[PDB]
Amino acid sequence: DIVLTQSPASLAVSLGQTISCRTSETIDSYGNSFMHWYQQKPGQPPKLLIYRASNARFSGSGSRTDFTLTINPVEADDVATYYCQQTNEVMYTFGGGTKLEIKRADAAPTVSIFPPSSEQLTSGGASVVCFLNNFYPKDINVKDGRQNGVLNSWTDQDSKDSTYSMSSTLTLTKDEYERHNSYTCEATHKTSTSPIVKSFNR
């Protein structure tokens, strides 16, 4: 077969500031063999960058067995996973892909807590939501003074400002929800030496 291998699996640079792809079977052995490099932004199809055939912002480098994509400079829009692929009449194949991260100054999370809707309460349930938004880095921890029924969901690094945002949810039955009063969502982030917290009474 043909095995595509790319280093590194994960990458992280800052704005202004290379990925290799190595084939097991060379491009030059087939008459119409092609190598491609793709960028996949999250929740999008992959898009073609550069190509190489047998016999500006981005560039391809290396030997006929190593197609090397080189991004220079890195914009904040360049946050994606990058795939190489080899083409011939017998098979197509793709590499493992490499995740690209932007390096940015650490940022304060903007935290907002929210109470159960009346529409969920009339349904018989109650869910408490906490958006921690636009915080660098991805590292963050969150928690009447339970840890069951919690559901979390992160976002990918933002393409505009290189930021991460997280959503958390604590969920109860209608009757169990009023068995307590003060609901406080505690946000343990790195940069804020104080654990950013927000709560509601009812």
Binding site: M91, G97, T110, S117, Q120, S127, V129, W154
Partner: protein, 213 residues
Amino acid sequence: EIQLQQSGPELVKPGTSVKVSCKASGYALTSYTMYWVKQSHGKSLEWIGYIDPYNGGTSYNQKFKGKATLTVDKSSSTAYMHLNSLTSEDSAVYYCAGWNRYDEDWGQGTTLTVSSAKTTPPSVYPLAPGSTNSMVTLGCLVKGYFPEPVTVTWNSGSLSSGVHTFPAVLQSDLYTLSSSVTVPSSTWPSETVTCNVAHPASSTKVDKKIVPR
């Protein structure tokens, strides 16, 4: 020179066969080679097979030999991918692409869910804050729907860049996701802010005005 439009998302039962379509448009369409990729949720891309629409040449990944059957319909400018003997391992996003030396287009992806579970609409619940700053973050919760995908816009797309739609999470055989919109407090609650949820599986579209209390 080429643009590709894949068919809608799909929920099918194990042990049946789907056919997903890719409608091409553009110039010199037989010059483009059609192929199909599988991307499993949060996994890498794997090639399925190709079909040369000009001469009928086809070549498949060994793993899908027997499984997948690519055809094209020059008459209707449509590539198809047929899939047999369907199981849960098959459910994923399926892209269609077309290419030659000059350019290349991919389709938008087709989410296919293999399950014998029935479709479940989302519960769309508004998120208003309690009780200070120019910005006010609202939200909207879509609770326990099946299957995924689901499309969430704010004010019919009039609000964007102020949005954070969070990847759905599987909890107890169902998906639930949340999305935060941030606007000036000058604007809210004076201006009516609305959550839009499309669940094509359950043929659902619901708007939930966020209200202040």
